[PDB]
Structures are given as C-alpha cells and as structure tokens.
Ligand binder design. Structure first.
Ligand code: WB6
Lengths: 300, 237
C-alpha cells in the first residue's frame, strides 16, 4: 500500500482521490493519503473552497516514484512533486502515520469500481496524451483543450488525444465514401486499432482516460473525446466480439459512477440515443442500455 | 452558413456557385403486384445542378440502371447525387470550380461534404429557401431528355435561354423561380399560361417561349395570379 503525503494544507480545499473526496479546512492538520492501492493509476484532484473555478489534479502511479503534495503560495495550487530520497520519504511517511495525520484510501473490499474505470489506463499512455516528460505524474485541469480543439492555443498545456473526425480523409477511403461514412469499420479496425492504437486495450485506455478527465475536471474536450470513441465503435458494423463485450462493461461502470446531477452536461443525447437505439451495436450493449434507461431515461 | 432571404443577393455576385437539387434523382411509380401487394418501379431521374448567375443547368441524367440491386435507394440517391456533383467539380479546372455549393435539402450536406473532402475550400451550404426546383421535370424539354435516356448522360442546358441579354441574373432567377413555383402548384394552369398563344414559339435551343419584355410582364403577372389563387383554392381564402 502506497502513500501520497502532503507538506500541509494552507488553503481550504476539497481533495479528491480517485472517486473519493473529503473537505480540508484552511490550515487543518492534513498530511495526506495512505493505503493507496498499488497496481492501478490514480488521480488526486483539488477544488479550492474559494474558487470552484478550475478543478485540477494529478494522474500518477505509485510504482513510478515517491510523490507528495505541496502547496505553492506563488502559483496558488497544490503541486505534486517527486522525492528522489527514498529513505527521507519513508521516514517522513512513517512519522505522519504514527501521528495519524493521513486519511486512508477508503476502499471497500467488495468494490471493483476503480479497477473497472481504469482497467486499460496506463501511465505511459497518459504521459503521451499529457506531454510533460520531466515529471512521472500528469497534471490535468478543467480548462485544458485538446489537440483537436486547437485545430478548430498553447501546445504545451494540451491534451494530445487521438484525433477522430468522421468527416476526414483519414476516416473515408476515396471510392467508399458512403460505405465508410455509414459503416465506420474501416476507420475503427484498420486506421485506428491496427494503425494508431495497435490494439483495443490502448483504445479503451484512452477512452477511459477521456471519461475520467471529463468527470473529475469537467474537461469538455475530454468528454468530446470519450463520446467520439464510443460513437466510432457503435457506428462500426464489424467489431470484434470481445471488444463489444468489454465496451459494454466499461460504459456500464462509467454510467454507474457518473454523479446523478452532472448527467446533463457530460452525456451527449445524440451520441447515446444513436449508440443505444440506431447504431449497428444497438443490441450489443445490454448492461449499458439497462443502466442508462433505469438511471437517465430522460436523456433518451 | 445557411442561405436565406437576408443573404439572397450573394447568389448573383461573381463567386461561381451551384445550387444542387436532388428531389428528382430517385423517382418511382408505385403499382399493385399480381398478389395485390405494392411495388415500386424506378424511372429515370436527374440531378438539377444550376449556376444561378449564368443560367447553366448541368443536368446529370440518373438512369434506372444505377439502382439495380441496390438497397435503401432513397439514401443511396443522396450519395449518388454527391458522387456525381464531386465528379463535375473534379472534371472542371480549379479556376472554373465552384467556391460554394448550396444544397436545397439538408439531407445532402453530409453526403456532399464527404464526397468533397478533396476540396476543403469549397463551402457546402444549406438554404432556408423553399426553392421550386423539383418542378424542373415540368419543363418539357428537360423531362424529355430524362425519359428518353438509355444510359447515364450529362446534358448542359441554359435555364435562362437568352434572358441575360436583357435582364440581370437577379431578375432571371426571380423569373425562373416564379415559373417553377407556378408549375409546381398547378402544372396544367401554368403550362396553359405559357403555351396558350401559338404565335410565341420556343426556339429549338431554348426551354421557354420567346416572349417580348411586355409579354414576360403579362406572363409573370399571370403566374403570380395562379400562385395566389392556388393558395386560395387550397386554404379557401
Ligand atoms: C460551377 C460552374 C462551372 C461552369 C463550367 N461555369 C464556369 S459556368 O456555369 O459559369 C459556365 N459559363 C459558361 N458556360 C458554358 C458554363 Cl457551363
């Protein structure tokens, strides 16, 4: 079990750790988060009590280093940092636990939610979507735009998601205009899966990462990306059976985990009704369609 | 964005454009089968492509053979339309190519956008006008070439005859739309109006009779009356 210690908590902030969150008061004696499950990526995220504008956070994998949080009073935010002195780190963390100034990652033993939301997400891929190679963790916030959004402005602070565009020469083979636009199998299987992603796990990993950034940060370009990657599968007549079955599981847990009140901005009516009721795969997402209809019947 | 009353005169500026109407691409007669069920029998159609500034109508005749063994023909028709338009844009040199194509039905936007990806600098636009181009098959010489075709064919027509010799393209487009609106609302009355007087002939190279200016004003008046009336006759007013 790993730990992300905090130097202190100088400003009042709602701190999130994966799907959990807790309020820390200004200068409350908070020294971070323990018992973080090894083997998964994690995200620790922040919303200041003073400025609910800009949720922000850090994706990290505790196997990649010892990481801590330290508030920066100049830049005005909780910053993740790496401690290279492993001995110094263990020592500090041991002390903080002794004084019990750390919250415990509150994982219920029945609960596979986080595994199921991050099954295919890998830090190495996160770090290529979020380019900042001096660090082993990745900063995202609400306002970051995607490489695709910049085509339609600072390239350093972008989300370099894979550009999907259904009305593009990459999506459409000369000679199969109608065929490729109505059945996107070529674009999914040849261009994207075989060509760019290499395999369905990397595709699902980006899809899952896009959703989580949309959910935790209200990142609009991420939500667009999540929906694009869903729609590309649902609009392909030819999809490996294992991908469909796993897609259904992936989306099920995303829909299950979405806050009830946020469904109106994070869920594209057109994409979902098309995917559940018009697309080739309208009959192939049984779990997703059942949870959607019982939880968000309004949208449909 | 969309073409409407407010940007109406853009049609007559010096940026070459085309209006594309697909309403006569896929045409069927509906009949009863021996077993008493219903079947369709396709008949030849056309893509009504009009340069609204000069008058040229690049009529691409859609022979029934293009539908043989195809499913979802109303959807294919939009893509066939797009494919034929794209082919015209490609055959043309860059300077002669249209800067914009306006489709008369929004269902053509995606098919044409997709077929025109090779031409990202050609704007594809819808319109909010209810243009009467579906009545182009009520022009006898156009209907005739379409029904007689035995193979795919493209025939170039001037839908303004020689009018631009005397009137502007704004005025010629208005005359055309009035004539087509009339023909669409009551083709019989409309055609009687146009051909009542034997002495006024349709030149062999023309589509409409050789009306003088004064005769066009009477004609245009009568077509208005027709359209106003048919509108009464319809709503009882
Ligand atoms: C998109 C339109 C392309 C054609 C080739 N034009 C340039 S035209 O419609 O003005 C035209 N001008 C003269 N002709 C005989 C034609 Cl036809």
């Amino acid at each position: 079990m790993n730990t992300v210690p905090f130097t202190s908590a100088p400003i009042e902030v709602t701190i999130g750790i994966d799907q959990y969150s807790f309020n820390v008061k200004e200068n409350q004696p908070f020294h971070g988060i323990k018992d973080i499950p090894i083997g998964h990526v994690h995200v620790i995220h922040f919303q200041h009590a003073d400025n609910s504008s800009m949720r922000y956070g850090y994706w990290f994998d505790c196997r990649m280093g010892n990481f801590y949080i330290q508030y920066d009073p100049k830049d005005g935010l909780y910053k993740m940092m790496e401690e290279r002195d492993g001995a110094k780190f263990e020592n500090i963390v041991h002390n903080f636990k002794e004084r019990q100034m750390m919250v415990s990652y509150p994982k219920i033993d029945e609960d596979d939610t986080w595994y199921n939301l991050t099954e295919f997400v890998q830090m190495d891929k996160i770090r290529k979507i979020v380019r900042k190679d001096e660090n082993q963790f990745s900063y995202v916030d609400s306002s970051m735009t995607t490489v695709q959004e910049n085509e339609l402005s600072d390239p350093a602070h972008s989300l370099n998601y894979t550009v999907i565009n259904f009305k593009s020469r990459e999506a459409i083979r000369p000679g199969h205009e109608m065929e490729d636009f109505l059945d996107k199998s070529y674009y999914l299987n040849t261009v994207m899966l075989q060509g760019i992603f290499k395999n369905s796990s990397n595709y699902f990993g980006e899809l899952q990462f896009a959703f989580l950034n949309a959910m935790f940060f209200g990142n609009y370009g991420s939500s667009l990306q999540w929906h694009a990657m869903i729609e590309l599968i649902c609009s392909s007549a030819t999809v490996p059976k294992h991908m469909l079955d796993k897609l259904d599981e992936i989306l099920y847990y995303q829909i299950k985990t979405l806050p009830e009140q946020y469904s109106d901005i994070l869920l594209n009516e057109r994409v979902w009704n098309i995917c559940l009721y018009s697309s080739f795969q309208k009959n192939s997402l049984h779990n997703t369609e059942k949870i959607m209809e019982n939880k968000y019947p309004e949208l449909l | 964005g969309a073409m409407n009353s407010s940007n109406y005169a853009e049609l007559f500026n010096n940026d070459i454009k085309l209006f594309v109407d697909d309403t006569n691409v896929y045409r069927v007669t509906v009949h009863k089968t021996f077993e008493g069920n219903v079947a369709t029998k396709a008949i030849n159609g056309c893509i009504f492509t009009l340069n609204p500034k000069t008058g040229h109508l690049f009529l691409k005749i859609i022979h029934t053979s293009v539908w043989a063994g195809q499913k979802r023909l109303s959807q294919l028709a939009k893509w066939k339309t797009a494919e034929e338009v794209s082919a015209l844009v490609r055959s043309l040199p860059k300077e002669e190519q249209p800067k914009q194509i306006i489709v008369t039905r929004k269902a053509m936007l995606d098919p044409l956008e997709v077929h025109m990806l090779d031409f990202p600098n050609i704007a594809i636009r819808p319109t909010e006008l209810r243009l009467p181009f579906s009545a182009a098959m009520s022009i006898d010489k156009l209907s005739d070439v379409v029904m007689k075709a035995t193979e795919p064919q493209m025939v170039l027509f001037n839908i303004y005859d020689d009018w631009l010799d005397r009137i502007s393209s704004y005025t010629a487009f208005s005359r055309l739309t009035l004539l087509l609106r009339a023909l669409k609302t009551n083709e019989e009355s409309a055609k009687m109006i146009l051909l009542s007087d034997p002495t006024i002939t349709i030149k062999s190279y023309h589509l409409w009779p050789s009306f003088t200016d004064e005769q066009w004003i009477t004609i245009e008046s009568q077509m208005r009356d027709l359209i106003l009336t048919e509108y009464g006759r319809k709503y009882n007013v």
